[PDB]
Amino acid sequence: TQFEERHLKFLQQLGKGFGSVEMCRYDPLQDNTGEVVAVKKLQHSTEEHLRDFEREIEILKSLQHDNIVKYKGVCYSAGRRNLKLIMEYLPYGSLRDYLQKHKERIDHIKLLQYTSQICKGMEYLGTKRYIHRDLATRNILVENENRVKIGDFGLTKVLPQDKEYYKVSPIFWYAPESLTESKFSVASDVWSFGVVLYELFTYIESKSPPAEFMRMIGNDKQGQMIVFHLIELLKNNGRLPRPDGCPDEIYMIMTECWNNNVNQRPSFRDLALRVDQIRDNM
Ligand SMILES: Cc1ccc(Cl)cc1-c1c(C(N)=O)cc(-c2ccnc(Nc3ccc(N4CCN(C)CC4)cc3)n2)n1C
Structure with a gap:
């Protein structure tokens, strides 16, 4: 649920619009393995864009259903000065x-x-x-x-x-x-x-x-x-x-x-x- 930035490795860009999503591997054992995840980022954290991104995260975390994409956690990147959402891939x-x-x-x-x-x-x-x-x-x-x-x-x-x-x-x-x-x-x-x-x-x-x-x-x-x-x-x-x-x-x-x-x-x-x-x- 809390993912460290140093272990989240880029695999592929998946989409860009307000924000973008990348495919990443979470490899905390630093041995070229780990779960594959999708990572959503902003592309501007203003007071409003960030409040709304936080609300989106809380909404997704509150949902658990077979036909809703699975929330996995958040990554607080840039030395804990940015926020990215982690979902299943x-x-x-x-x-x-x-x-x-x-x-x-x-x-x-x-x-x-x-x-x-x-x-x-x-x-x-x-x-x-x-x-x-x-x-x-x-x-x-x-x-x-x-x-x-x-x-x-x-x-x-x-x-x-x-x-x-x-x-x-x-x-x-x-x-x-x-x-x-x-x-x-x-x-x-x-x-x-x-x-x-x-x-x-x-x-x-x-x-x-x-x-x-x-x-x-x-x-x-x-x-x-x-x-x-x-x-x-x-x-x-x-x-x-x-x-x-x-x-x-x-x-x-x-x-x-x-x-x-x-x-x-x-x-x-x-x-x-x-x-x-x-x-x-x-
Ligand atoms: C679909 C999408 C388009 C633009 C932007 Cl900015 C984001 C997203 C998006 C969202 C979203 N809207 O929150 C969530 C995801 C997401 C989450 C979990 N898994 C994935 N998988 C995924 C996404 C895209 C692909 N592609 C398959 C075909 N190639 C042309 C484009 C990329 C393959 C796999 N995407 N994506 C890509």
Whole structure:
């Protein structure tokens, strides 16, 4: 849980954005062995960036579930004047990258297994009153061809005790009330989950949510005019189309997640049971 900087050895850069993640080996016996881990760092520790990184760490440390990336600890580097987060290393990277690269390692059985696993991770988040706010396949990590886990808790908020929403952008995954009122909730996570289910069945092909919504809106639109047209389109029932080859019953689940009426969206528990019944009945 506390990792010494002198024993954390660099293996590979894994991603860069606010921060970056590297693969490292933790080798305290200095003999070229040790566990392989993923290390997240800031790229600026301001009063605010660091408070928020600390909150992200506390959030991840508080979670223990099969479909959530495992917290391992922190490293206080630069002679204890910097902070890095230590997580397990998942070899196949983001689900967005994995689907696009390994397009037939993957069939609909695997897609519905990943869908189930994401729903169960989100059920677990709900028990802690955590709203993820950035559910997308870029933020889901692949352990192996049968197991994915939710990552990136950088945007996650904790519901106040007496409220069912938090008022606070990946606009093409946002629910309409998040666009118009900055309101996030379990129900807006279910809206974003419907977009993740759409991303899975497009296999990450010109079919991405930004590409398809910009085609609907007008490809030439720029700046706030995009947001104005995306809000007006969503409020009057404009939706992403059914992906090629997607079963109607899986499109129905996306459609029900994308309800403008916040209280009529299904829960993650409803979704996991429905998806697993679909899996078990085929
Ligand atoms: C995915 C990602 C993109 C950009 C940035 Cl800044 C960070 C991350 C990220 C996060 C995160 N968002 O907190 C967590 C991780 C993470 C955690 C545990 N394991 C891994 N494994 C992993 C990550 C990426 C890969 N790649 C596989 C394909 N090549 C093209 C790119 C890198 C392979 C393995 N990543 N990553 C890479």
